[PDB]
């Protein structure tokens, strides 16, 4: 079933150009073929953090943790808990450590 793994990478790549409605069409394919699987909601939560609506993604990750009760869905249980951390990650990070010279934004303390 590897086509459904490269079609979600096409979705992320389309959000990386600005083709947001074709990128949404790629998550919508997953829920079109799998209407009741939490995989499709995990890819909608991905699309929301790739369209800058992280306030929806922090709620939708809680909604997807409600799809975890069996040994069929232990991967889903990890998948929405890292999606929740990385929604808060993508909104809350600023990449400035304000100390040393290990990474930094460009310039800052090496000019």
């Amino acid at each position: 079933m590897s086509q459904f793994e490269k079609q979600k990478e096409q979705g992320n790549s389309l959000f990386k150009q600005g083709l947001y409605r074709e990128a949404v069409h790629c998550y919508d394919q997953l829920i079109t073929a799998q209407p009741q699987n939490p995989v499709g909601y995990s890819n909608k939560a991905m699309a929301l953090i790739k369209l800058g609506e992280y306030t929806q993604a922090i709620q939708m990750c809680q909604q997807g943790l409600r799809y975890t009760s069996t040994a069929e869905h232990v991967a889903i249980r990890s998948k929405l808990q890292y999606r929740l951390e990385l929604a808060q990650g993508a909104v809350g990070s600023v990449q400035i450590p304000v100390v040393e010279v290990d990474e930094l934004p460009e310039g800052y303390d090496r000019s």
Binding site: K8, E9, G11, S42, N43, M46, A75, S78, K79, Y82
Partner: peptide, 5 residues
């Protein structure tokens, strides 16, 4: 378990 960057 990770899915999309």
């Amino acid at each position: 378990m990770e899915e999309v960057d």
